[PDB]
Amino acid sequence: VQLQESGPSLVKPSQTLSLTCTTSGFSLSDKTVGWVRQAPGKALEWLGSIDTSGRTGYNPGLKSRLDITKDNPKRQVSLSLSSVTTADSATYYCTTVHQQTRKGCPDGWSFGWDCGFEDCYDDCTDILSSQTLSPTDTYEFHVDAWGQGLLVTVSSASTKGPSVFPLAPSSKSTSGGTAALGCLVKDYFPEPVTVSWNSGALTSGVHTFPAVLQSSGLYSLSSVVTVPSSSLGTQTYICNVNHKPSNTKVDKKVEPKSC
């Protein structure tokens, strides 16, 4: 089961955020698709879903700004969130959800059909003096599969692609047999940026740090890798920076210094 969120990484305040989830491996007439988000430092928050019959349900506190539709042949579900503010900056997840409404009677109480014959009865023997209670509906919810999520930032600031600079190894970054080298990913907006090394061939000993929000309103981060000091003369090291908010990818070769 695949769930792929798509849409803008940046939306201006008061505008309408529109996202799409492309699905695979199941039928939208068999599974219900829901939306969940998480704002920075906050808890998971339900948005809404559209079920196998096409019925929509929403978070009551957000219903005035939400709309969810689906296209069964195109296998896509769409979410719209109008009049956005910075409280709507969050990671938005497409999900498959279990939703069921169960109708039942309390302990001991049984339906009129169960008592031997649509209301709940206590004494099935003395049906003449038994009380007729309407059933209490129970509701079942859980998230089945989670998409990877799409980070959305609400801001009036403009998109900016990153500048990538090498953090070159020298005698001052070597620890005998190993050496640290990296890339500085400077001055981009909005988040996020991901960094790989040598097109994903180099994975051991990598750490990409979280970004700083500088006073300029732009983010910067670094990614570092520990390599054998003996390889610095012969092995090539390239950091691959991806900034989807600007449709930018940068590869930067990190050359060791002769110092």
Binding site: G34, V36, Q38, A43, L44, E45, W46, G48, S49, D51, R55, T56, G57, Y58, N59, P60, G61, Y93, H98, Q99, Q100, T101, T138, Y139, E140, F141, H142, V143, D144, W146, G147, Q148, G149, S163, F165, P166, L167, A168, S170, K172, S173, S175, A180, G182, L184, K186, V206, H207, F209, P210, A211, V212, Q214, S215, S220, L221, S222, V224, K257, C259
Partner: protein, 214 residues
């Protein structure tokens, strides 16, 4: 509209740990609580559904239970990979109206202490030719996750241009942090050296770079 969870829960490796989730008769009392695990850098993962049933791949040490309007997630023996944020959830008044818990951060204690490795990079020639200068102090492989970072220009304290990230865990379960000193090319060239000094527990490590040395 959230279910009440403790904000922080901690335990040592091997210890029993429980996370509670208190709601009302209109949510948790419905009797179908779910539980979710969020590890930074990973999408959320469903742990429990229907009060007690484990999702696919969830280890047996995770159990869920419910007593009235309060649900509990229990780890019988805490292991290193359980360090994460945990969220309960339940429908309310409708199967399509989900309320998540306020969230619990689980910290697993017991791993060995580790002194930080510090690398200080001077501004690259590419950045200097672009009329900018950033010194990058990278701090890695330490535990516990608290350091203090200070900068020097020559031997004098740096009082401007510094930005430092909060420590966060590497893939080897140790902590790393980064600190940046933004300068003009003039400031960089005019001093004899700059230093990043990192204090962790009872030690300080200072790394120094100089414009004349490269």
């Amino acid at each position: 509209a959230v279910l009440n969870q403790p904000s922080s829960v901690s335990g040592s490796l091997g210890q029993r740990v429980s996370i509670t989730c208190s709601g009302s008769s209109s949510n948790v009392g419905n009797g179908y609580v779910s539980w979710y695990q969020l590890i930074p850098g990973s999408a959320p993962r469903t742990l429990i559904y229907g009060d007690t049933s484990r999702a696919s791949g969830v280890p047996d040490r995770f159990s869920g239970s419910r007593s009235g309007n309060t649900a509990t997630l229990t780890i019988s023996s805490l292991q290193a990979e359980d360090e994460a944020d945990y969220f309960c959830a339940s429908a309310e008044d409708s199967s399509s109206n989900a309320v998540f818990g306020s969230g619990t951060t689980l910290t697993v204690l017991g791993q060995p202490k580790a002194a930080p490795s510090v690398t200080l990079f001077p501004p690259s020639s590419e950045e200097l030719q672009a009329n900018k200068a950033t010194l990058v102090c990278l701090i890695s492989d330490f535990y516990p996750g608290a350091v203090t970072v200070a900068w020097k220009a020559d031997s004098s304290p740096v009082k401007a241009g510094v930005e430092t990230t909060t420590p966060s865990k590497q893939s080897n379960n140790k902590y790393a942090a980064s600190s940046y000193l933004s300068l003009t090319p003039e400031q960089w060239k005019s001093h004899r050296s700059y230093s990043c000094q990192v204090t962790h527990e009872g030690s300080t490590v200072e790394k120094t770079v100089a414009p004349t040395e490269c």
